[PDB]
Structure 1
Amino acid sequence: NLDIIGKRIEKIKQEHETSWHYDQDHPYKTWAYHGSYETASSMVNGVVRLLTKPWDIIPMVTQMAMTEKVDTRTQEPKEGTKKLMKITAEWLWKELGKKKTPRMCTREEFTRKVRSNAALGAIKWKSAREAVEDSGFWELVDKERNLHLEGKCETCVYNMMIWYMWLGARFLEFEALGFLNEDHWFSRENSLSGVEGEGLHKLGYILRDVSKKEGGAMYADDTAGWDTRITLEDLKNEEMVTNHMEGEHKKLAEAIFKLTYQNKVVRVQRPTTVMDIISRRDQRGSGQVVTYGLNTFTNMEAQLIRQMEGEGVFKSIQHLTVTEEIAVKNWLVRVGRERLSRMAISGDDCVVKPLDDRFASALTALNDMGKVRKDIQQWEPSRGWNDWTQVPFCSHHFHELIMKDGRVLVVPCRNQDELIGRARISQGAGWSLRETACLGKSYAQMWSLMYFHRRDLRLAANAICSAVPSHWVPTIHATHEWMTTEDMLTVWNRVWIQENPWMEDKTPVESWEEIPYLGKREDQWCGSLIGLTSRATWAKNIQTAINQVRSLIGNEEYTDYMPSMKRFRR
């Protein structure tokens, strides 16, 4: 308690000593309140919207651009649950460690990241790019760092909104734990369940490979507030990664887990406006990228245990017998790798193809670990999927699509209203017409690469790339091959043919017309506006929309991509 968070509390209390009140009308029950002191909406991308006019009248698209569970308490698991988690976690860190070496990340790696611009989620210095160059920052980092070796913390404080800390705390986190992401610990090759750095063009092939295994249905249960259900027991099993570490690193990592993860401190703005200095031990509070890795780890653990319960490796979560402990360990050593290979896990998101459908009603460990399923009753058995093409994963489903030459594409898909609505939204303001156009172009090239099989998206993508100057540059499961000025057909051939391990025949495709679409009926099912008069007017009069946007941007060098499509080929 206060002996670990006090210093951080004391430092803040003094920076606002003038205005400090211990409010008695504070809304926190499960969060500890210490005191109080006085104290970037969604915009529309006009380039994308002018080139998607039929969607101006679709409420699912237009509503997307308009516009308390953290204060809950998860009970401590039973002793038999806690045992199962401890044994599985120890075995899983060993497996992940077999072919990887934990190691500290470096400023010269962190710096380069800030130069490339990433969601480091950091709050004297204007931007992050500036602070990185000023050694005064690195001096502050040194003081804190040397404090962490002391077993103490001063400035590592969360700001609720998404939990931003200041760039310095983010570095000390990245220094100790960045290896997890930087060195691909949750790669499919390394972790067997993971998909880190796979890409949306590989996920469908991965789910089809799981489907090939003998077993029951495919289960894809979402957790209700995954992060809020992260117990102190989960934070302590995650910390066992430090047992694979040495020297300074082991100390630095131990400090992040002890002082920032297992004993947090947060400043939340309450408009009644008084900045509450609230604390708590449990729930998920980290950088988005370390959160991804530890979420994947803990999810892999929970799902192996749910598989154990379904296969009758253990009878009761209340207590584990000495013989059961040996049986769990023997199960992991004998079949652990096989059972990891039956799953696709991305943070809190999973798909499991268990040995059989006993898994569907194996609920006691899952519920007692506090990973309560969403959109169902706690003890109602899971609904599985019989077809890998119906399974939801990372907000997508996957279609099997046969090319006119017999080669097989497995393509990602979601409701087209969600795709068009997202492309019409920008995260921030103050951007130029040029920067808005380059973001439109990023969406267009993503659509050409991932969603080429949707008739409306291939047409709108061609229209946007025709409307934006040819040479202008586009601006954690994913890898982003669409962020380039290279020709999109060349990138398509690299991604879907050359580099695709599921494609035996490497014959390049010579034109976009060789590249197939979904069934005309399969397109409407996933939200296409084909067979509507509106969409017909838009398609026919596409060159007029392209010319409207060219006139707004001005006299630049443009390319006509519309003749890459059959209907505009004269």
Structure 2
Amino acid sequence: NLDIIGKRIEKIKQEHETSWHYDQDHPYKTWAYHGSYETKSMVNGVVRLLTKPWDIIPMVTQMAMTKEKVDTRTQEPKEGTKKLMKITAEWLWKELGKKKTPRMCTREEFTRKVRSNAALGAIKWKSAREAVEDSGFWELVDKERNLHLEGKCETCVYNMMAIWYMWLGARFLEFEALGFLNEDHWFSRENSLSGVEGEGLHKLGYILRDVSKKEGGAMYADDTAGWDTRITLEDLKNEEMVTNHMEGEHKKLAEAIFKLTYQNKVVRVQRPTTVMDIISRRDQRGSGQVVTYGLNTFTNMEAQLIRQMEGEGVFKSIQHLTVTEEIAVKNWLVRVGRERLSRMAISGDDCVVKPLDDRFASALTALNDMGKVRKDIQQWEPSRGWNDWTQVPFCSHHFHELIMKDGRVLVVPCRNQDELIGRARISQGAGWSLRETACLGKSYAQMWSLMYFHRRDLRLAANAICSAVPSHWVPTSIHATHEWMTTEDMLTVWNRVWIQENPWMEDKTPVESWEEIPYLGKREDQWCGSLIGLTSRATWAKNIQTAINQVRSLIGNEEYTDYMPSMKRFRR
């Protein structure tokens, strides 16, 4: 314990030896308190001016205004639960590894990611780009590395905010050991028949409909109450078994990240009373946001196969597994494991399962005892499943089946339109020029034109924003692919995404205009949040050229395209 965290603790203690106070009124009983020291949501105006009807919708406007979960302790699974998890985890890493080779990620790869600007949740150097251009930083990584090979840690400390930051150096060493999981698509659907990494919103609906085609019971989509807080040291040990597939240096580096920064953690949390509190603990999810996605997917795949085993009566008791029950669990995994993975869509802590039958609904002993407690339902109340794949929630969406005038079938993502409009009206951080604010609006507009084209208000607002922002200005700012981030014409990108590259579309005839591209039903559009039929919305649509001109006047004398005549009503 303190042998693995002390140096990190000893080091911090000194840089702040002037104020090292062992507060006796610290609010902790689940963390291990160590000491304390002295320390010290903006609206996008381009989108808001082009969405005026929503200025009076509280679900939109309230989105732009303005832990007791982390300080909890998950129990220890029982012998039979621990055996089920170890056997399943061993088999799952083997399956994921059959067509993939673990490998170390490179300084070169990491530098390019930073040059391309990506969320690396990092903290001598201003930005992350400058540090990647300083050899001293790399000498620091080297000292830290050999330390990890020396089987010890000095500088890999978390900062809670609850999303924990590490400094760029410790992010590098995490990426070097484990980035292959994401960089080489270990959770692609093709490689892990449950995963959806890299799939994209335009694919998720087709995937759920493919699961719906399997013979079986209802579709179950139980959310876990605070997934990251329910990750057990036993979960962290089964995730570590990926190092068993590694060799040489890599295996040792990966082992150190798991041992020193996962199965042991040191965190700095700011407390108002404002001090810095240096706390530690073993279990719970604390990793980069990308590694956390992959390991969440893995452990979720594991938990859901075990829940399926319980429904199928592969085992009777989580208390203890018989010897013949071990061979049966193994027989089941080898005989039907891949078939049972294909009955799932799993995105980190989010899942949809189509089990063999509805015994799964009341198979709760392993799921509860693994600590993966379901959200807003009583611990022993059977799960309520969905009968129709078009009503299943997944990755904050539902999916509609939409028939084009030519008979071809689109499966399209959807959510409450208030949520879509409210999110596009928010920027993150400040220092934003009018130009950079306009390019973010453009990025939302292009997303709506490709993914939400079927919502009458969003196709009209997207056309209006793309009309209001200079034509050649470039849009700016893990299951997803951002095809809207481009200056290419949006009808050409629509054709590539929905027709050309769409494996569920046999007829490859390109669409010639936006009017070939259908909408949801008028009533189905209202149900999912549309303002069609309101007076405010009618005035907005009728007078849209006046709103477009207001924003053009603010941005100034630039080159604009009118995209509004791409809609039937706006044709002279």
**TM range, normalised to the smaller chain?**
over 0.9
Offset from partner CA, 1:84-108 (integer Å, 9 cap, x none): 0000000000000000000000010
CA offsets 1:303-325 (integer angstroms, 9 cap, x no match): 00000000000000000000000
Q: Return the alpha-carbon distance in structure 1 between the equivalents of residues 165 and 79 of structure 2.
A: 35
- Cα displacement string for residues 268-299 of structure 1 (whole angstroms, at most 9, x for unaligned residues): 00011110000000000000000000000000
Q: Displacement of 1:349 after TM fit?
A: 0.0
Distance 2:396 2:124 in 1: 39
What is aligned with 1:115? 115
Counterpart Cα distance in 2 of 1:546 and 1:430: 24
The C-alpha deviation readout for 1:38-97, integer Å capped at 9, x for no partner, is 00x910000000000000000000000001200000000000000000000000000000
Q: Which residue of structure 1 lines up, in the alignment, with residue 481 of structure 2?
A: 479
* Alpha-carbon distance between aligned partners in 2 of 1:93 and 1:163, rounded to the nearest angstrom: 27
Instruction: For 2:285 and 2:12, locate their aligned partners in 1 and report how far apart those are by CA, in whole Å.
Output: 23
For residues 302 and 428 of structure 1, the distance between their equivalents in structure 2, rounded to whole angstroms, comes to 37
CA distance in 2, matches of 1:332, 1:278: 40
- Residues 427-485 of structure 1: CA deviation (Å, up to 9, x unaligned): 11011000000000000000000000000000000000000000000000000000000
Q: Distance in 1 between matches of 2:3 and 2:489?
A: 59
Which structure 1 segments of 5+ residues have no match?
none
How far residue 236 of structure 1 moved from its aligned partner, in angstroms, is 0.1
Q: What's 1:493 paired with?
A: 495
Q: Are 2:227 and 1:218 aligned?
A: no
Q: Deviations over 1:312-359 (max 9, x none)?
A: 000000000000000000000000000000000000000000000000
* Distance in 2 (alpha carbons) for counterparts of 1:29 and 1:473: 50
Whole-angstrom distance in 1 between the partners of 2:107 and 2:62: 42
- Name the structure 1 match of 2:142: 142
Aligned partner of 1:19 in structure 2 is: 19
Q: Which residue number in structure 2 is paired with residue 510 of structure 1?
A: 512
Return the offset for 1:398.
0.1
Coordinate RMSD, CA, aligned: 0.8
Equivalent position of 2:539 in the other structure:
537
Structure 1 counterpart SS, 2:346? strand
Q: 2:285 corresponds to which residue?
A: 284
Task: Indicate the SS of the match to 1:87.
Answer: helix
What is the rounded CA distance, in whole Å, between the counterparts of 2:150 and 2:393 in structure 1? Answer: 47
Inter-partner Cα distance in structure 1 for 2:452 and 2:429: 26
Per-residue CA deviations over 1:371-400 (Å, capped at 9, x if unaligned) read 000010000000000000000000000000
Mapped partners of 1:458, 1:131: distance in 2 = 42
- The structural deviation recorded for 1:138 is 0.2
Offset of 1:362 from its aligned partner?
0.1
| Number of the residue aligned with 2:249 | 248
In structure 2, distance between residues paired with 1:136 and 1:15: 20
Displacement of 1:217 in angstroms is 0.0
Q: What SS is found at the alignment partner of 2:376?
A: coil
Q: 2 CA distance for matches of 1:28 and 1:441? A: 46
* Residue 148 of structure 1, CA deviation: 0.1
1:246: Cα distance to partner? 0.1
1:264 CA displacement: 0.2
- TM-score (norm: length of structure 1): 1.00
Shift of 1:414: 0.1
Q: Secondary structure at the match of 1:224?
A: coil
Once the two structures are TM-superposed, the CA of residue 407 in structure 1 deviates from its matched residue by 0.1
Aligned residue for 2:108, secondary structure, equals helix
Q: 2:178, 2:546 → 1: CA distance? A: 52
Q: CA deviation at 1:254?
A: 0.1
Query: Structure 1 residue 521: deviation in Å?
Result: 0.2
Aligned length: 569
What per-residue deviation string (whole Å, max 9, x for no partner) do you get for residues 146-195 of structure 1? 00000000000000001100000000000000000000000000000000
Q: Aligned-pair distance for 1:539? A: 0.1
CA deviation string 1:390-415 (max 9, x = no partner):
00000000000000000000000000
Matched residue SS, 2:413: strand
Q: Distance in 1 between matches of 2:551 and 2:431?
A: 19
Residue equivalent to 1:384: 385
C-alpha distance in structure 1 between counterparts of 2:324 and 2:41, whole Å: 57
In structure 2, distance between residues paired with 1:290 and 1:427: 23
Secondary structure, in 3 states, of the residue corresponding to 1:256?
Answer: helix
Per-residue displacement from partner, 1:465-524 (whole Å, max 9, x unpaired)?
000000000000000000000000000000000000000000000000000000000000
Of all paired residues, the percent bearing the same amino acid is 100
Partner of 1:196: 197
Q: Deviations over 1:129-159 (max 9, x none)?
A: 0000000000000000000000000000000
- 1:61-76 pair list within 5 angstroms: 61-67=60-66, 68-76=68-76
CA distance in structure 1 between the aligned counterparts of 2:432 and 2:513, rounded to whole angstroms: 35
Q: Aligned with 1:37: secondary structure?
A: strand
Q: Measure, in 1, the Cα distance between the counterparts of 2:571 and 2:517.
A: 15
- Residues in 1 aligned to 2:237 and 2:98: alpha-carbon distance in whole angstroms: 21
**Residue in structure 2 matched with residue 557 of structure 1 by the alignment:** 559
TM-score, normalised relative to structure 2: 0.99
C-alpha distance in 2 between matches for 1:118 and 1:525 = 36
The 1-side partners of 2:428 and 2:235 are apart by: 33
- Following the alignment from structure 1 to structure 2, what is the Cα–Cα distance between the partners of residues 74 and 387? 35
- Partner SS state of residue 336, structure 2: helix
Task: Determine helix, strand or coil for the equivalent of 1:470.
Answer: coil
SS in 2 for 1:190: coil
